[PDB]
Design a protein around this ligand. Structure first.
Ligand code: PLP
Ligand code: PLP
Lengths: 382, 382
């Protein structure tokens, strides 16, 4: 009933509260909850269901499989996926009524042929590369793509339901690239409208833009991270300041507590040495579980009413902590990350420790780690 | 039938060849194939089956669940797990005939009580903390533990089948700690034997020790990493020099190829800027898939017959590469890691790029990534 090694407790109520907090931030726009990568490590279906119930009108995933998984779980409503490769399940996605993004001619031709076999009109969204340089259509190819799209629409094969883009530095407030991208978007959106595209939705904002630039809202805001109670960056503030509540709490049970003499080496490479006769504790969770190895010696953990730092190298499935004089016993609970409001270490605390960003921390929590759900409605977790 | 985004191809024949290569390294000792953490990211059951067939007499996992999963898949033979927490499935493991490690009195008492309910004798192995400072019994507590064990044996509740330890710096050839640990092991092993313990197996070596110190072989060698064709460290040499063959090859299909002008920013933070009008390619695999974000700008990838470096920041599910003048098209295959013998980038190549160790690279490949099996016997993959 309760994992005895390490587990992730997901508060579905924090999720519902967050999308409401976020919906109030962009009152004029609709909210798309991005649940890609297993809902950033929190569990795709349960979180998708919870977000929807709290007001999310759109669901967004990266791959078709992720979107199809949502459908197979009986989730209804608008869903969109944008990461496609030649040969993907165009037919299956069209038949399940999922909005697919198009960034190249190759994509448009595969969806057109698939809409035929399916015998239905595919809802496509044109992505413009306004400067990120990742996916999307470059300005110099936009004209051609927009034309091919309105033509495919005429043939009744597809129907352009949206025009969108994505920011590269929205998490860095006041970055010059932000404005440059927004203008490029406006100008590219305009050209599409004049040439014949009448989209249902116009969107470009992610979590950081949604929280900072209301001029980026438009018809839809694509919020991923903020929905799970984690702030895109310390620059924007803490989840507390943003009015967000962390949904994930990673817990582990101590596997051992013992006394060691001064001068004793701890873990691989012996990068840590006891300063005196002290009590060492073994946390049974390592990098294969999602604890970044790069956080060796820095990672914060709450054990015996005090924050402890990872003693030495973090291993594949465990790492040790120095309890100093304090005492604890095997089976005692240790909190690796949770709510700063409860005096626990947080996702950002670990991002700093591992020299990375909070995004990677929560998302990289291993499948080996069981998830336990609280809050939301009973049928949300299944 | 074939993943169109990103997938891991596991050569089961490389696995069989490796355990044979390794068995020849320690002719006098028995080989335990460590398949913990989903066989270091290669797939626990298929790899466990293959290794066994090639000569592995023992199977080793960290958690009871991992070991129980092996049993539930019909795998027969000796299995051992060492990472336990109070409340674990002692009974279930005893009933499935799995050797459990004991490092504290608390563990001994839980197994004794469980052997009663089970109505059988539990095969336990005493772990000595010879200097690693992780799990195991500290020298100052050894006497007491050994006594409690021989007493529990008398009561017919348990049966000490082994005495073992683990190295902290065996991957660093000529490290002083290695010898110090080996001597501590010999002396601790002796005391156990005199006091009444007659073990089936005596072991302390991991992959690096097995390949370097034949005096650490004893009755059993616990080889994990080397079994998958990856070398514990560049110091020990390359898989080629060690006579090992890499079992994993990570492949991805290009999702887009487009032309961008000079001075264009690429990915989040705009940490990369095109030097000239060039061709950018989008690799649909990111850190949520196991591509370390810390390898941003350094990660090697084979595309269009040439090694390319990750252009800018690596995202959650994708990253871009600069093809310069070369040309490729969506759907073209890119190799992220494979066999250095085939001119492909390797696990170590990525460890360097991400400032980590090859161990973390293969093990952290996401569950989102499908595994495809080749070689071995047809029933191996199921
Ligand atoms: C992941 C993603 C989002 C959501 O970003 P957050 O910063 O997590 O809110 C939005 N749009 C696209 C294209 C994405 O890939
Ligand atoms: C993982 C592990 C091994 C195997 O180590 P490799 O270096 O991968 O061969 C051996 N013993 C213990 C206790 C382990 O945890």
């Amino acid at each position: 009933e309760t994992p005895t090694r390490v587990y992730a407790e997901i508060d579905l109520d924090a999720v519902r509260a967050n999308v409401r907090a976020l919906r109030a931030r962009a009152p004029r726009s609709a909210l798309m909850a991005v649940v890609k990568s297993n809902a950033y490590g929190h569990g795709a279906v349960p979180c998708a269901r919870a977000a929807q119930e709290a007001g999310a009108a759109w669901l967004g995933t990266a791959t078709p499989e992720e979107a199809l998984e949502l459908r197979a779980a009986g989730i209804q409503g608008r869903i969109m996926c944008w990461l496609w490769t030649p040969g993907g399940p165009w037919r299956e996605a069209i038949e399940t009524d999922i909005d697919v993004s198009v960034s190249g001619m190759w994509a448009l031709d595969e969806v057109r042929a698939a809409a035929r076999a399916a015998g239905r009109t595919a809802r496509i969204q044109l992505k413009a590369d306004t400067g990120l340089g990742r996916n999307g259509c470059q300005p110099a190819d936009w004209a051609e793509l927009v034309g091919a799209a309105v033509a495919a629409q005429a043939e009744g094969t597809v129907q352009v339901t949206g025009v969108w883009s994505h920011f590269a530095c929205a998490d860095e407030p006041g970055h010059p690239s932000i404005r440059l991208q927004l203008d490029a978007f406006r100008d590219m959106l305009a050209y599409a409208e004049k040439e014949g595209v009448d989209p249902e939705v116009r969107h470009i904002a992610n979590s950081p833009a949604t929280l900072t630039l209301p001029e980026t809202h438009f018809d839809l805001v694509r919020t991923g991270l903020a929905v799970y109670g984690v702030s895109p960056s310390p620059e924007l503030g803490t989840p507390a300041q943003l009015g967000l509540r962390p949904a994930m709490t990673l817990r582990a049970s101590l596997a051992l507590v013992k006394t060691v003499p001064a001068g004793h080496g701890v873990s691989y490479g012996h990068h840590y040495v006891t300063e005196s006769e002290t009590h060492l504790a073994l946390v049974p969770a390592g990098y294969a579980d999602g604890i970044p190895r790069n956080a060796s010696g820095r990672g914060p953990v709450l054990v015996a009413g005090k924050i402890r730092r990872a003693a030495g190298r973090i291993a594949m499935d465990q790492f040790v902590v120095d309890l100093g004089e304090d005492l604890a016993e095997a089976g005692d609970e240790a909190v690796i990350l949770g709510d700063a409001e409860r005096g626990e270490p947080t996702a950002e605390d670990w991002a700093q420790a591992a020299h990375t960003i909070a995004y990677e921390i929560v998302t990289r929590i291993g499948g080996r780690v069981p998830r336990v759900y609280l809050g939301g409605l009973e049928h949300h977790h299944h």
